[PDB]
């Protein structure tokens, strides 16, 4: 896993996944309460019923992160225009990953016409604020006060959210697929392994999609009931691929005693994301492991006297190592318990440095 | 001391000394009890008195290891022939060093005519038997059933005691000096640093000199009282040079709490003679430090979990190191506490490997 043939240490990481699967997404809007009528879009119009009570017509948020059977799908649906959605009213889908992940992409399978405008936000820590990841809209400048298909200029801020209309046309009344790719278009993505900026940009504990506006044909110009019952959001699969974040100090994440997902921190690191050196392993500062060298926390010396030490920066600057031992057993002094305390000596058979 | 410029470890040893100085030698015979009369040898004969009570005529064993003032001396004296000494009766002088030394030489300053025959024995450990170091006699074969001036043949037993008459002639009625040199004449003395045989041959906790026979002029052929009172043993200084044994793992010996002399064991060794690895430092076997490489006990790993380990030979054979850790704290397993016990993992913030 996190070590080579000879057994030397080396950078690792869990395998790529879709952190969404199983995760019960939360949506603000969900047709079915109370029962209402929707009508697929085309003439003709084969209308049906969104009903929460019956298991054959339910369309909860749940149908977003369940298995994807290309044969017959499962989707979540919004109340129809008639219920008062369209715009400015919006609908939200929040994916709670419960643990920081290194996100690569967020792809959506729309069971109806993709939205006219929608954005996709993320938090880097369950504390932190909702950050704009990407904006999709046929009216970027007007809807998101943002350029049509802006590109990130070199040198410029690698973390701004862009906007495009490329995915907002209605064209495919169904199967409308949308895919967000974090490092896509970031002038540094090549040097990613040494771009803290991007290394954080891909970081994410939670992801959110905001349906801001429905794409429309024009029929709803005159409040015809039968037409409104024809426009709504419907998603057949919410998939976000990336891999559990561990900084290259683990190759597998696992739920613990408290049922919260975490990293199996190798390289002598610990912490939820293996972002820190286990105490005692403070010979040098903690680092993300690269391909070049798989940074790993090195142990203190102490010579067995102390089982505890802190990281002394000055010591580190002077000598190569900076692991400073604390409270050395057997009246043995020194930065790494390597000497007898003044006026004490090592005298035969007795294990501890004894007085004069 | 026991480390070079850069501070790397290196072979050391206390400084050369005369382990005899101050040490109260013990002699079986000592004129003065009761008062008797001795007469220096030449005619004339200026006789005097050996008396225990008066401090101006006492000649205790003590005058053997006291400072040597070339101006006026101090010596220990035996009862005169008349008291019944000569031969076969012998007299003994036992130097108790109280701590194993690496002996180079034993030299004697005789205040009278050196003995006709005497040997010098040593023990390598206060337990062990009295071993013959050297034999001096004008009649080697007859007195010590040993060759006149035998030499050690190459390949042969490097530890046998030789004999010579070279120092038993009476010639100098006084100032007769005799010097024993351990490595002298030993075909291996050149390669000494890699000759356990010789390395032990020079080892010695105690030294003993045996006065077997007095050299005589012939006058005592007829029991004349005045002549017998003229023959006796008298030594002006007993000096044994060498250095406190520590195997090159110390550069100074010091008396401890119990007032018994010992080594200040560096190189991570301990024991009275630094002949063994402090527990925990069992990555490899203990060794005497040579000039080539200053063998030093290397520490076990354990990764801070255990503060105790034993030396596993098999481990040592398989991998370079063989320090095997015992009872690893924090349910952490492995030869050097480098892994979570089966069905246990390293999960964030918690220091110990916790269950599934
Ligand atoms: C659906 O997702 C969007 C995106 O986060 C949520 O909208 C956000 O809602 C909060 C509170 O309603 C807004 O915060 C407010 O910000 C303004 C100015 O920044 C400030 O004056 C307020 O004190 C407050 O902090 C946030 O701006 C807003 N984001 C955007 C761009 O609309 C929305 O709440 C989610 N669905 C829900 C729960 O309705
Ligand atoms: C002065 O130094 C000499 C040298 O050690 C002492 O002589 C040794 O004395 C012991 C006991 O008197 C002898 O041990 C005996 O050995 C024989 C055979 O090896 C054995 O039959 C006995 O059971 C016992 O073990 C030892 O041989 C002898 N050494 C020699 C070569 O004479 C002497 O005792 C010292 N001065 C004293 C205390 O009289
Ligand atoms: C959701 O969680 C349950 C229980 O942990 C699990 O059995 C189920 O497979 C999960 N659903 C998905 C989409 O994997
Ligand atoms: C003998 O021991 C005493 C007390 O330790 C010391 O003062 C004295 O100098 C010693 N004698 C010699 C010969 O050094
Ligand atoms: Ca689905
Ligand atoms: Ca003297």
Numbering used by the authors:
A (entry chain A), B (entry chain A): 37 to 78, 83 to 396
Publication text:
The LN domains are crucial for laminin polymerisation into a cell-associated two-dimensional network.
The diffraction limit of the trigonal crystals was limited to ∼3.8 Å in the c* direction, but extended beyond 3.2 Å in the directions normal to c*. A significant difference between the laminin β1 and γ1 structures is the presence of a calcium ion in the γ1 LN domain. The calcium ion is bound at the C-terminus of a short α-helix and co-ordinated by the side chains of Asp106 and Thr114, as well as three main chain carbonyl oxygens assume that the co-ordination shell is completed by water molecules bridging to the side chains of Asn108 and/or Asp277. An equivalent calcium site is present in netrins G1 and G2, but in these proteins there is a direct bond to the metal ion from a glutamic acid replacing Asn108 of laminin β1. Equilibrium dialysis and dot blot experiments with proteolytic laminin-111 fragments suggested the presence of a calcium binding site in the γ1 chain, and little calcium binding to the α1 and β1 chains.
